[PDB]
Amino acid sequence: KLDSKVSGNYNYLYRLFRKSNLKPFERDISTEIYQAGNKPCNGVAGFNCYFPLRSYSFRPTYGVGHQPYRVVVLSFELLHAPATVCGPKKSTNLVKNKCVNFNFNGLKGTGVLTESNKKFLPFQQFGRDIADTTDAVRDPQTLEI
Amino acid sequence: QCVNLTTRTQLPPAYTNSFTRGVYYPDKVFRSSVLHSTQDLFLPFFSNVTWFHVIKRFDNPVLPFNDGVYFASIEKSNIIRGWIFGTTLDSKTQSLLIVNNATNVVIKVCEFQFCNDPFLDMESEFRVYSSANNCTFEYVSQPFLMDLEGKQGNFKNLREFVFKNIDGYFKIYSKHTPIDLPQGFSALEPLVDLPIGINITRFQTLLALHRSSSGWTAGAAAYYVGYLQPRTFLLKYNENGTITDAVDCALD
Amino acid sequence: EMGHIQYDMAYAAQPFLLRNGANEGFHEAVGEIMSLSAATPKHLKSIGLLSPDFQEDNETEINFLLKQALTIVGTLPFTYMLEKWRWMVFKGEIPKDQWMKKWWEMKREIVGVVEPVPHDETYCD
Amino acid sequence: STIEEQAKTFLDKFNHEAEDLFYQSSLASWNYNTNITEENVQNMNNAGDKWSAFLKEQSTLAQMYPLQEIQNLTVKLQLQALQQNGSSVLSEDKSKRLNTILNTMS
DSSP states (O other), X not given: OOSOOTTOOOSOEEEOOOSSOOOTTOOOOXXXXXXXXXXXXXXXXXXXXXXXXXXXXXXXXXXXXXXXXXXXXOOOOOOSSOOOOOOOOOOOOOOOSSOEEEEOSSOEEEEOOOXXXXXXXXXXXXXXXXXXXXXXXXXXXXXXX | OOOOOSSOBOOOOOEEEOOSOOEEOOOSSOOOSOOOEEESOBOOSSOEEEOOOBOOBOOOOOEEOSSEEEEEEEESSOOEEEEEEESSSSTTSOEEEEEEOSSEEEEEEEEEEEOSSOEEOOOOOOOOXXXXXXXXXXXXXXXXXXXXXXXXXXXXXXXXXXXXXXXXXXXXXXXXXXXXXXXSOOEEEEEEEEOOOOOOOEEEEEEEOBOOOSSOBOOXXXXXXXXXXXXXXXXXXXXXXXXXXXXXXXXX | OHHHHHHHTGGGGSOGGGOSOSSTTHHHHSSHXXXXXXXXXXXXXXXXXXXXXXXOOXXXXXXXXXXXXXXXXXXXXXXXXXXXXXXXXXXXXXXXXXXXXXHHHHHTTTTOOOXXXXXOSSOOO | OOHHXXXXXXXXXXXXXXXXXXXXXXXXXXXXXXXXXXXXXXXXXXXXXXXXXXXXXHHHHGGGOOSSSOOOHHHHHHHHHHHOOGGGGSOHHHHHHHHXXXXXXX
């Protein structure tokens, strides 16, 4: 619907020729005219020296192999920085007055969730104990402890 | 662009001290009513901090960066805005530009070609550089509003920023409190973490002036530049979770 | 007609002047071989156009093999006759009075057809 | 560097350029036997000489390619096909006599 155009769409080009095999994750932009042989060319399009970028022709009536397909891929890698964008996988119902098992982002354990009158920070994660126990947690969706 | 302000006059670098402040939260994990022993990059108390006073008198020296610094700003007419960072401060290396155009705080890592004395000149046109190429990091912060109108008088607010580098990470600590040298204790909460990872050996302080090169003047403002050391402290927490006091071990 | 289209799908990855048959005549010759298998009585029992009980004796297949030899087998010396007229007039073999003299003499040779009306040199067959 | 590397760059230019112009005139030619109109019969004059102009402008460049040093089979057939010029080997008045006699035969 939003891609093809009646009586042509001239906006996109593809590069058909390259002198060697490209490395992965490499972008080349070139106005340089491709030289196919021993005869030199100064950047005008001459005999056996040809312009590398070739046009697309867009029409809805082609069928399945000649339609355009917009492709975006995701690249994942590891670096010195910690992991940034993580995942929602739906959540269960919150229950009270039962000894449960903890599954959080940074917190594992067990306990019974009761109300807390303590003053909290919006930034924080879990509160501690002198008894060396985690006695509180900040809920990220609605701000309470 | 390249031609700086020739009407400036510099003060000699006299030294002052700091007493009870400079304490930040070392960890993201909240703890309550304990006494915690941590090891991070801190400031030893009762040290020497260089006095700066900006009033045609301007203080903008060239200072190196080694381990860590503080910036404690006290403002009236909002002179000191942001800071520029980098190694050789040119287009040969990457540079951290933190500046506010009074829409949002602009944090960009690109290669800018700096002049000798860059300045910020309401605000009409902001150009500190001749050219820009090879940008890396872009960030959009929370917007703020302020007034550029010059006032001379008593100082009603404090402005805090912490520039530190641990393993390439840059964390910004900020606490906004109202009241030459105010006192009391402050607890600086973390806000913006920067995963940049570039080598910065030198900084410079940007100055904003109000009312081609003759008619720009400024109000009364002051800032502090400290040095840091990996010193072991203690912590104190109440039931609310705010730090009242911190104890340096190697002093007394 | 579906024998043309199912051949036309497979060579679509080839460049454009090599998009053809194997020769120039393979494009219209590709469909009649699978059209002959669709005209068989054994295939029509499975797809159900005929009766499920059908008796085929030795005189049933005489009508099928004669009708398929009318437009295919029986036109082969008739295809050969005017093509040997086509190559030999362009080599400078015959003059103007020998143009239609070679015509009915070859027609009673290859296919064995004598024309009932004699023709002049003002007529072209 | 060779003639074989020069021959592949001209014909891959010729491949996608002939996919656009063959489909454009045959879309109205599929509407020619579908609809007999006054509007599409002047499109046979409009898009019918677009095939005629394209084949002789690619035969303006490509007749100076030799067939002797070509190693690969594919390229040779494709090039013989490109080279045979058809009815354009005559003079001016002999070719226009050949153009008006085929309209009288049909």
